[PDB]
């Protein structure tokens, strides 16, 4: 509802491999406390097309910059893979 559960879209080799060929799959990063139903509602209230299904990924934090004078940990990410129906492809930028 508040639509703070759609933080940032991400574009990788896997994302672009899926984002072509009829059904498009758009991968965003979401609030780690959000659920699939909240993700579908946010896409409804901010894009307008009902997702066909949603898949979720949790990437655990890991050590980064190891051996550097001050080592640091990573940040917890939840990834969401929305898939719109056949023949529809909306743009992530431009509204």
């Amino acid at each position: 509802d508040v639509t703070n559960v759609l933080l940032k879209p991400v574009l990788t080799e896997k994302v672009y491999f899926n984002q072509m060929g009829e059904t498009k799959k758009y991968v965003f990063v979401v609030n780690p406390k959000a659920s699939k139903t909240r993700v579908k509602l946010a896409f409804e209230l901010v894009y307008g097309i009902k997702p066909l299904k949603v898949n979720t990924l949790i990437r655990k934090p890991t050590t980064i910059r190891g051996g550097s004078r001050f080592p640091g940990l990573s940040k917890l990410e939840k990834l969401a893979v929305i898939t719109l129906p056949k023949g529809i492809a909306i743009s992530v930028t431009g509204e």
């Binding site: 991400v10 574009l11 990788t12 080799e13 672009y16």
Partner: peptide
């Protein structure tokens, strides 16, 4: 031609070389 010249190396953040997008190479590295 020109897009061929602008696709060699210059690896983008989330991508690698070689498989540079055929249409999207003017946004990050503009």
């Amino acid at each position: 031609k020109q897009t061929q010249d602008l696709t060699k190396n210059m690896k983008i953040k989330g991508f690698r070389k070689g498989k540079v997008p055929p249409t999207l190479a003017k946004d990050y590295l503009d």
